[PDB]
Symmetry: D2
Subunit: 499 residues, 4 copies
């Protein structure tokens, strides 16, 4: 006996009963006589164009690959649902939070960042935990991460950052000089480099990690009052990382550890779950926060702004076809239904654009027409038409201009954005010096126990050692600024590695 | 009031009736509060990225167009059915002919040839008569023209021919020199040229012409008995052609004439139709025919090859959305169910490749998944997977390799290519002089009478006159070779023209 | 000897006198033996997949077409230069206006608006007049039209407007109901529609029409002193239009009359040219302007804001390959170099996005590298990399992240946007009631004379007659709001048309 | 200091020094003022669409990716030349072999097979060794592997084979059930499989393995005489393999072993090199020859058919930009200059279309225009035009149809292919019978020392051990079909692994 995972074709064969096999048809659905032998003139004669069976299937074969995700290319996903267990409708009128017991189906995808399609799960990298909510008011995409913060606070540097986190332009090899020259030049990353290199840097499976909407969002009650929030979905299976030693081990043993684990979990009736919380911040409060409540490289102290439960997140139906249901998955941060809105978070703002952007290029213009991405729990009706690979009925003969005197789709004013005032010059305001240590300090000596406080200091030096010298100093100079003992312990390890 | 075509919107609304307007949603199903004004800071302030309602709409509009067909770009389509009136089973096994009274859903697209998207319907040009049968053995595409022949017999010149017939590479204008140099350099074009400048060069609408398969085909009955044939779908609305003066009027008065005539013909229950006949030929009498039976520039004499009736072609349904149903329609000559096979027709052999090849580019790798293209009357099952914009289940979780031992789609010895023997050197045999006059001569003298010959000559002359002298004399010669007088007449009008 | 355009292939010959024909090769440079005959087994044998030559060509022929422009699909282009003849440096620091007697290469494309690629040139429709300036600070695209205003003033209506301007989704025909239902419901269009149906609605080719920026832009000088402006480039060939009667003739006679006219003019050394002026308005006057200064449906009286000579545009060179240098041509209003900026014009704003966006689809991610679109007069150095069909060296092995301590490109502080203050609530402000008749009323009464008013209403009435009765009522009512006489005239004609 | 690959940026900044850094600009060439801070209204305000600096960069980043090769995604590349050392003149007229000492530029890409973009270098899997010769008669693409045979013999089985070597349709993990089920059912693989698990199954870098043309080819001399040859190029740095435990750790130690290895070799002046040899066999000999001389699972023995030397392949140049030069590199087997022609090898013939076909997909219609793919040591002249992303001048104003009377490119009768008379029926002949054991035996005993045999058997077991029992059964059957002790040794190793 084998595991569910490896027993895939197994179960399929049985579940196919004793019903004869279907017929191998061409793409056009024409019956195929023999597809195991080309069409030739003579036993040793040349290939005839006439073998269209060959062309038909070969042709398709030549185009199965589509561009992989720019970032977060490696991962897996499953389906399940969300169910309300609290009433926060006093905070947001989002139909998804209707009443208690309210269930909305979902799709989830876990993933790393820097690695490519061939990469392995078991490595030190942040993680992607995206949630798609098929609500009655369209789809809501909570494209979150296993962290409440990020390395940078302005989108304009994200590409550059990701660049530094991947291969060298010429060599095509990972490069420390790149990694650390960047981080070192931008301390705002401190807070996050601290989490990545902490024990959390490498979880164990996707099931033993927490989620974070990260950014500061906006909730609008069915009364127009708005308030800021933060999304958190802590694991119920409890945290659980992996020994550096084991990581690199599993790495080459089963580079897809995360996949099968998460997969067998569901196959073996052991469905993973997370608990949804949110922190609330009135506009009054925000005006008070000692920091930028919108800074992505900052958190909200749990004590000052406590979490409120709202619901359960359950995954219990593994995909039936990986390509179709997971690869093709598209999550658009901009996909926020009535009740939730973005904040002036200079990083969340940019994400409003880029995601649907790339999706147009990675998948295609009508990518929202792909099953997995189709908002089937709603009714898409508008004035958009055509485009490549246009399935559906393209909305039939319905009037295609608005406004029209022919009863075509009208807009519901009730779903209007929330009104806020703004005053100030249009400029490129500097966010580089918006405190990149304080919050980090209270992490080192407070959240981290002397036990793991040192571990982190090891993980870093072991990677920082590979960078040039001038680089290593700046880095230390930064850690030092968080805490002298920080850059002191590190500089130690480095000096030794240095012989 | 006015024609049904012009009453489209009026009707669509009256169908709405009691139903109320649908809510205006984004591509993501999110309702919009006001799709008529932008989100800006202040009434005279900047536009914000935050307006994802705009970007959602704008971004789609920007991606509405797909490449138009490289030829036959202008056209119109309709849906109807096929009806078996005669048992021809003793010739072919195609299940579409399975039994008299059998109806097979068909789709059809009419079109011109050279003109682009916005060209006029009423202009001299061959006419496209593509027919699609959704059978249980997959789809059969009978991509015919309104001519039984063509200007050339080697697919290798098709690109060149179309280039000569389209715009000048630098001025972008129509070029008579290009048109005539090519023609004058390839007399094998004379047959189809004659037919082209004849009263049939411009029919009155799409309902007033016949549909031909042109190429010789192959039919194999339930006993595996091979036979050659030709398809003919003669119009039941009678052959009506349009004068040169009126075609010129409509050219600007109504460039979409054919589209309108057709829509309305059906919108008023005036379903046009065509009787589908076919002629048969033996490999014996084939080796006996005085010409290459697969030469696209020739016809099988009626006297020797009487037409055999098969069934009817009724068009009784208009498209509901032109883009999804007509624009995206794709016909591949290679889609022939068991019972219909190609022939050594050089030209035919070429089309076996070109159609799906161009479809993979104009529409996309997965174009067969387009509703209008999907062979629904049949169920597709094979090992091809993925590819961009993959709808449906991607065959869910069935084995993607063949052979296998888990019960998945299989062969069909029943549907195997009819085997024919061939022999001979393998080279690029020259077909430039396989009689390019004989059948034209009989046309020009016995098929036409003095008034038609008169017109035919001015028609040719009125266009040729704009080509360079040397191309003129060049062209004359070819004509005289079909007949001294044929040439002399055109010559006459030429000098007058040169005046 | 005919007009130059007709003798293209003739001169190409002459051009390379003695020079001998080059060897015919495949796309791979492999020389071809015989491009006129297909390689088959025996003179009447099947086609061999081994005939790569054929397959090489056919595959290319099969993908020659790219999506046509979403709007302004039918056009013509040329190249020339822009010479500075007046000092306006006190207004803008743009290097293009840098000094008296300075010439900058420019590219231009003329066009219609709603017609597809096959469409005719001489049809009532605004006319695009896009100019690309290859300047030192990158390219500057002044994407004007032949009118200084437009039909709408908020980008959200554009897709809707265009849709109503094209073909019925189901019939694929032009629908006057669609056209007038829209216009009737959006009275802000009166001005344009009034200009459109006037005499200028159909110029005598491209050479006899003015060009305009339409929008208001902001000009910035060396001390950072800004001012709002308008760009006008008047034809030196003098205004000249076509009678509704001619155009209809030309429509079928020479659908490419504009293309042919412009080409030949240049080909014969009769270079056309426009004089570029600018209208200036300080930030103070804007505050007290009787209308919204960024309202595309309004003009700046010549009386209060005089025109100022800037320089001249001269077209002296025709394209060599239309597809290469014209069809691929791409203009982005976003291409504004230091010294030239946008205004809050809602319409202009949405444009900053849609052009590049649509270009990424029509042409491709790297369309800026196509020769005609490359800023060859400036040096592109940035942190952008990869993408399909990537040419040049991809910036070689240069550091691909910013910031970095390795001497890669750096931003220039002197090229910072002119800051401006804004303050207001963030929301969708309504711009419908913004006076839609004042300026129109002036045009009807003062700008036109009795002769003209007569034609205008004739032209309108001639088209409007086809719209449903209730729609005609609506629109007539709108014209009345402009002027009682205006409505009666049309109404009169209508009554007539209605027998 | 550290290796050359590590000091990449170091050297770049080194040679770049003594210069001022370039100004950062937009794709359009406009200098950016600050690329680190987005444009907003007020320090805590929203992001404006006005920020085209942002959209430009991000939009591009959103499009950096393109689909990876359907197979062989993971690979390294370099450039060098081919030096003729010997005269095989009396075999191929091919200019590349013209004289002794003749230099011809080349490009090479080494790669694994079933692994995706993120996969590791040092794994058991065949190795891809492709070489592109830029010759004056166009490019010659010798697409070889690090072995002279291959699992299958009919193209039709290939896509299916590949599916088994990749991930499961639903679970997405490497699956030995499909791997082995396929191989078991298909015993012709026996040869390669043995080689696959041999000591060579994992080379120590790309520098210590041999290249193989694999298929039988055809050479033609100045006097129309052709023969059937083979291509063998042996490493000069010697065949050095990697242990199963060595490669296993290298897996996570440094998954980019090949890359680093090859980059540094070339970087330090230690250019690798190979010697090209050609086996030969006359058409007569081909006849008398035992089994099928075009069977890809069979080989020619140096015994009866000796290895004739032709020249040297030296690599002395690294890529400057990996994406532009290696990723975009496309090799088409169908690219064969005069003197070299395909052979009846089904598998081969199938590759004749599959390669350019997928290139048009993965790279684009105009891929032969990407610098490194262009046949630059030749001169492209033909009648192909347009297509997306068209560089150059699209052949300028030259006539675009053939034949023509305006002195455009003419074909070369001298380049006509070799005419090989062919006869025989026409149908899908069986191939599963060609002795899948003879040659195989002369390996397990002759070309393989006892020691290797030991671990070889151990390898197959180490993998197969995870396959369904029934699978193993059949698996051994074939092995024993080779020779008893073979399957026996395995069969023993089996039951043990089953605890
Ligand atoms: C009929 C069977 C075969 C088919 C259908 C086939 C198909 C393909 C395809 C589609 C690719 C991807 C091309 C790209 O994306 O650039 C590829 C690449 C490759 N194939 Fe095959 N192949 C076959 C047999 C073989 C054989 C026999 C060899 C060796 C003689 C081989 C060597 C390679 C190599 C080395 C590459 C990588 C080239 C590169 O670096 O770009 N293939 N093959």
């Amino acid at each position: 006996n084998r595991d569910p995972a490896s027993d895939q074709m197994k179960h399929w064969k049985e579940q196919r009963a004793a019903q004869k096999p279907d017929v191998l048809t061409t793409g056009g659905g024409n019956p195929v006589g023999d597809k195991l032998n080309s069409l030739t003139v003579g036993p040793r004669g040349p290939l005839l164009v006439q073998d269209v069976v060959f062309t038909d299937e070969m042709a398709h074969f030549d185009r199965e690959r589509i561009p992989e995700r720019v970032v977060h290319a490696k991962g897996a996903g499953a389906f399940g649902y969300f169910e309300v267990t609290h009433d926060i409708t006093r905070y947001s009128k989002a139909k998804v939070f209707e009443h208690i017991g309210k269930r909305t189906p979902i799709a989830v995808r876990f993933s790393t960042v820097a690695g490519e399609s061939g990469s392995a799960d078991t490595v030190r990298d942040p993680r992607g935990f995206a949630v798609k909510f098929y609500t009655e008011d369209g789809n809501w995409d909570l494209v979150g991460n296993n962290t409440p913060i990020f390395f940078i606070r302005d989108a304009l540097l994200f590409p550059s950052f990701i660049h530094s986190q991947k291969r060298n332009p010429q060599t095509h090899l990972k490069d420390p000089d790149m990694v650390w020259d960047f981080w070192s030049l931008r301390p705002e990353s401190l807070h996050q480099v601290s989490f990545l290199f902490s024990d959390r840097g490498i979880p164990d499976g996707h099931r033993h990690m927490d989620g974070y909407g990260s950014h500061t969002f906006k909730l609008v009650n069915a009364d127009g009052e708005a308030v800021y929030c933060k999304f958190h979905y802590k694991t119920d299976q409890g945290i659980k990382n992996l020994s550096v030693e084991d990581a690199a081990r599993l790495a080459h043993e089963d580079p897809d550890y995360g996949l099968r684990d998460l997969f067998n979990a569901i196959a073996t009736g052991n469905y993973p779950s997370w608990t949804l919380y949110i922190q609330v911040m009135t506009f009054s409060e925000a005006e008070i926060f000692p920091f930028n409540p919108f800074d992505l490289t900052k958190v909200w102290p749990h004590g000052d702004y406590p979490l409120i439960p709202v619901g359960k997140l359950v995954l219990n139906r593994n995909p039936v076809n990986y390509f179709a249901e997971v690869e093709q998955l598209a999550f658009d941060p901009s996909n926020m239904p009535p009740g939730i809105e973005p904040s002036p978070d200079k990083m969340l703002q940019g994400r409003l654009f880029a995601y649907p952007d790339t999706h147009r290029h990675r998948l295609g213009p009508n990518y929202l027409q792909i099953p997995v991405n189709c908002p089937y729990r709603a009714r898409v009706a508008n004035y958009q038409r055509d485009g490549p690979m246009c399935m559906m009925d393209n909305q039939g003969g319905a009037p295609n201009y608005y406004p029209n005197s022919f009863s075509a789709p009208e807009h519901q004013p009730s779903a209007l954005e929330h009104r806020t005032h703004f005053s100030g010059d249009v400029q490129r305001f500097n966010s580089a010096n918006d405190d990149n240590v304080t919050q980090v300090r209270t992490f080192y000596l407070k959240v981290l126990n002397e036990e793991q406080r040192k571990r982190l200091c090891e993980n870093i030096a072991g990677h920082l050692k590979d960078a040039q010298l001038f680089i290593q100093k700046k880095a230390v100079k930064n850690f030092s600024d968080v805490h002298p003992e920080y850059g002191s312990r590190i500089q130690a390890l480095l000096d030794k590695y240095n012989e």
